[PDB]
Amino acid sequence: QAVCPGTLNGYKLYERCEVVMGNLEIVLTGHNADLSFLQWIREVTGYVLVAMNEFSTLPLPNLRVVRGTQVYDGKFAIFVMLNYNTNSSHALRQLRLTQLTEILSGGVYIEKNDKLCHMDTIDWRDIVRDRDAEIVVKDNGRSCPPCHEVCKGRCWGPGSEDCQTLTKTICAPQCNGHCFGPNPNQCCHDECAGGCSGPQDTDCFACRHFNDSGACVPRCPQPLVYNKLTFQLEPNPHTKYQYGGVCVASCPHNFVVDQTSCVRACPPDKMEVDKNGLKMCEPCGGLCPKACEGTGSGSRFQTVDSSNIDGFVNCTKILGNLDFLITGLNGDPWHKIPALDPEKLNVFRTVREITGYLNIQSWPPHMHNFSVFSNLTTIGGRSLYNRGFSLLIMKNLNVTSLGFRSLKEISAGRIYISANRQLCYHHSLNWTKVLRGPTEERLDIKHNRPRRDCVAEGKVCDPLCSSGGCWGPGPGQCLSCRNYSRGGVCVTHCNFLNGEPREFAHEAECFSCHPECQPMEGTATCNGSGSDTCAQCAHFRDGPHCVSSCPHGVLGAKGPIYKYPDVQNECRPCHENCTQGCKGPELQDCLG
Amino acid sequence: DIQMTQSPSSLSASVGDRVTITCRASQGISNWLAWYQQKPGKAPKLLIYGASSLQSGVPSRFSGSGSGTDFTLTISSLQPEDFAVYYCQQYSSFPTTFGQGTKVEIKRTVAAPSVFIFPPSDEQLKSGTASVVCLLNNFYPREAKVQWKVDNALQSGNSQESVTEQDSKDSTYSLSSTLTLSKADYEKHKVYACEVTHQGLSSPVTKSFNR
Amino acid sequence: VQLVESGGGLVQPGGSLRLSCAASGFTFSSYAMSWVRQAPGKGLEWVSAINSQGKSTYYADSVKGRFTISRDNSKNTLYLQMNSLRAEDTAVYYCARWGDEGFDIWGQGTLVTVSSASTKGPSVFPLAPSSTAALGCLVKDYFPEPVTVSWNSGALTSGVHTFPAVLQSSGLYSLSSVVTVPSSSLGTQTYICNVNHKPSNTKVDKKVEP
Ligand SMILES: *[C@@H]1O[C@H](CO)[C@@H](O[C@@H]2O[C@H](CO)[C@@H](O)[C@H](O)[C@H]2NC(C)=O)[C@H](O)[C@H]1NC(C)=O
Ligand SMILES: *[C@@H]1O[C@H](CO)[C@@H](O[C@@H]2O[C@H](CO)[C@@H](O)[C@H](O)[C@H]2NC(C)=O)[C@H](O)[C@H]1NC(C)=O
Ligand SMILES: *[C@@H]1O[C@H](CO)[C@@H](O)[C@H](O)[C@H]1NC(C)=O
Ligand SMILES: *[C@@H]1O[C@H](CO)[C@@H](O)[C@H](O)[C@H]1NC(C)=O
Ligand SMILES: *[C@@H]1O[C@H](CO)[C@@H](O)[C@H](O)[C@H]1NC(C)=O
Helix, strand or coil: CCEEECECCCCCCCCCCCEEECEEEEECCCCCCCCCHHHHCCEECCCEEEECCCCCEECCCCCCEECCCCCECCCEEEEEECCECCCCCCECCEECCCCCCEECCCEEEECCCCCCCCCCCCCHHHCECCCCCCEECCCCCCCCCCCCCCCCCCCCCCCCCCCCCCCCCCCCCCCCCCECCCCCCCECCCCECCCECCCCCCCECCECCEEECCEEECCCCCCEEEECCCCEEEECCCCCEEECCEEECCCCCCCEEECCEEECCCCCCEEEEEECCEEEEEECCCCCCCEECCECCCCCCCCCCCCCHHHHCCCCEECCEEEECHHHHCCCCCCCCCCCCHHHHHHHCCCCEECCCEEECCCCCCCCCCHHHHCCCEECCCCCECCCECEEEECCCCCCCCCCCCCCEECCCCEEEECCCCCCCCCCCCHHHHECCCCCCCEEEECCCCHHHHHHHCCCCCCCECCCCECCCCCCCECCECCEECCCCEECCCCCCCCCCCEEECCCEEEECCCCECCCCCCCCECCCCCCCECCECCEEECCEEECCCCEEEEECCEEEEEEECCCCEEEECCCCCCCCECCCCCCCECC | CCCEEEECCEEEECCCCCEEEEEEECCCCCCCEEEEEECCCCCCEEEEECCCEECCCCCCCEEEEECCCEEEEEECCCCHHHCEEEEEEECCCCCCEECCCEEEEECCCCECCEEEEECCCHHHHHCCCEEEEEEEEEEECCCEEEEEEECCEECCCCEECCECCCCCCCCCEEEEEEEEECHHHHHCCCEEEEEEEECCCCCCEEEEEEC | CEEEEECCCEECCCCCEEEEEEEECCCHHHCCEEEEEECCCCCCEEEEEECCCCCCEEECCCCCCCEEEEEECCCCEEEEEECCCCHHHCEEEEEEEECCCCEEEECCCEEEEECCCCCECCEEEEECCCCCEEEEEEEEEEECCCEEEEEHHHCCCCCEEECCCEECCCCCEEEEEEEEECHHHHCCCCEEEEEEEHHHCEEEEEEECC
């Protein structure tokens, strides 16, 4: 955990930091204050504020850079003032800033520290990169020892080991003020924010963009890389994540990887998932798993009312029960709750699992089916209503069809379907296949519309429907498909050797062939959902895959990959010397 | 698919000689060729990727060259160690395809064999079988004739030869011809002999034993 | 950085075999892997590849519909589930890693042998010296291949020659592993040949000379 944030406003609270993501502010600290944690601090993005402190020495021996992105009094990167006690002999007398090579922006202020010394000996211009910044270092300690012979009149403390080393030099107008020497060849690396040791990307005192383990780099190692054998982008085995301004192989203590950077929490669009020890943020591809409390016993809320309903948006699984009572539907005026808007019931079109029960005794008159509970597949029944019921549908005068289009299971409980005098299709339903264990006696179906009256008007299941029955009218409202299934809709055949969107089958379910396959006639277009399972490529073929275009500039482990299409539209590779891409296979065919 | 055709199939050269191996690909492949080395009974070792790009810690004598169809693998100064079968690999096309290999072996000085005869194990004879082994340790070239004489009678149609691959160090060969019999026929005779005729022998050597 | 194949033995034709490649010394999870087979004593043949994640698998045409490539990134192992095994599938099966470019690291290879014949352990017989001297071990009548013969538990290597085995008149293999020593060292050194036929779980240490 190298990088930690720094205070904004200027007992003792400490951070064992390396890189300070903000300002280092040491204000009102005791004479007997142990500052061993400061010994690892090398970089300060903001400023250093050392005001009114009784400790005899400030030890920051690793501090090499103060970025000065944030500045104290809008003028300084280093502000050292009043670090002395008026009556007590205890006062700041030495600044251990030996390794302070530079201040990227901002100025320097070192005043009113009655016993602080050796500051007048230091060449601040060899530190302060900012040409137009101010340097105020007066009114400090007096009668102090001269800089030890080995420190040529420049030192941070009296000791032979603590002297100020000069790093700044005159830069040639080919360096842009970044050089390790005066010669035009002695220019700095593009990624140094400041000065040099030498020309290499490692020799920087501060990185302009990122620090990938010693070397200042613009980009943190890319997460995907084109694989020549696999003919596609693959996770790069050299990947590092952006934890602050540092490139990190692993994400720190409870930090989830997202996109390419180390993050504190997962975005709404993604979900936390472990894979190979690292916790990454995988995209959901639509809706992410959400858990809502619910109604019934144990819960605060009694019925799905106009106020509580909004707290079920994007909810895929309810950790409780659902109660649709007249009190919530028509609204309770005793505790000033308004009537429920029917268009607001469309928040359950996302619900897939109910841990407990689903009680529906009230429903809008223009809503003739439970079409909102379409995505509902399984009902747990951990908590049960009345005598031990999981599914309760009674006294619903204007319900024509059940509408539970994709329900496959009800783990535990009892069925209750009564007084829905307008309800049909439920007769044909094979409850033995839906409810686990014995359905003997624990099935309640009475006082609804009888089959005789359903058949007479034409209220019967589709011919494409199986022996198991149906949820309502049409091919879509089926429990099981006789032949094939489309998007839940029972179909005769998939579009195998004919049709606009071409398909393939898997467990009697039709799935469309990848957009890149060529529509084949008299034979299958694909034998899988893959861009590689095609019979023919409608555009180009990059190895096993049918592609929209040939790889051109896709980064590989060994550099950018450029390929051109064949006469047979196949992605053949460009010549090694084509740095921009190519028309054909020769060197004469290089692009530029 | 892309066919990889290596040339030659077998190659003989002295230690120090500049050995060259070619590789032509049926279709265009740019510089997407890998070169492998496969010493007897071992997994292939990646020498060159790219087409000229050298793998880490592979001796500097190994070099690659080419683009598109015709390729070259070159060994600056052939070494005894360098004995192996070399392979091609195109990775620009699906499936990835290899060459048939180029068996590179050392052309060295003439070395006469060390002939050895081994009369059947008493434990073998206990099992009711007799095998007489003839050993020809460290010789060059690999071409050697071995005749079996049992009571001066030429025994043809009961023996099996087997030769080791070239030596990693001394670039020699070793042959193992074995005359096998039932304990029966074996006891029914006394003088068993090896008639080794090699290029490095002026006279044909005979290593015999008696029961 | 190493790979270790396992499971390659002997199957009857039409049989089944799950090969296993144990990856160590690297982040197996991050590299696309492949199986490459080598029928005796012929060239190299890419047999199947797998995606780093494992989402995408590719099979060579000869093997499609029969072999199934997989990997368990937790167990740091890779698998080749070969089914409806044809005689033409007898090969040494190398499991190799696709590096940044090329198959950089390869395992030792496991030998699968599709045959209707049953397993028979070798008989180990001493080939004794003399008239430098030479001694050996006759590793007679065994099936399938391979056998590994070491000397003095590995302490002896120089001048050793384990010969390529020969299929005999019978359906069985046999080899001789000989070692050439300085003539003097006969009433001096102890020579033990250690033979191992894994298919028959035969582990024979035979003393030659004393
Ligand atoms: C880039 O990162 C490294 C690691 O934080 C910095 O180097 C460390 O700092 C000091 C002085 O160089 C040494 O005591 C440590 O050994 C170094 N650690 C490592 C892991 O290298 C380096 O200063 C950073 N900054 C720049 C601009 O290069
Ligand atoms: C609940 O539902 C949707 C999920 O799509 C969220 O609404 C989206 O909000 C984002 C920004 O937050 C917008 O870019 C989209 O236009 C909105 N989507 C739609 C379909 O309107 C909503 O934020 C989710 N989360 C919560 C807690 O309400
Ligand atoms: C479901 O009810 C709505 C109106 O409530 C109606 O438009 C639709 O046709 C119904 N579908 C059925 C009965 O399958
Ligand atoms: C789930 O609901 C969403 C929105 O109504 C829909 O896109 C999706 O197809 C439904 N899925 C199933 C399996 O019902
Ligand atoms: C259903 O409500 C409708 C209006 O949607 C009404 O016309 C009808 O009378 C009610 N159902 C009955 C009484 O069966």
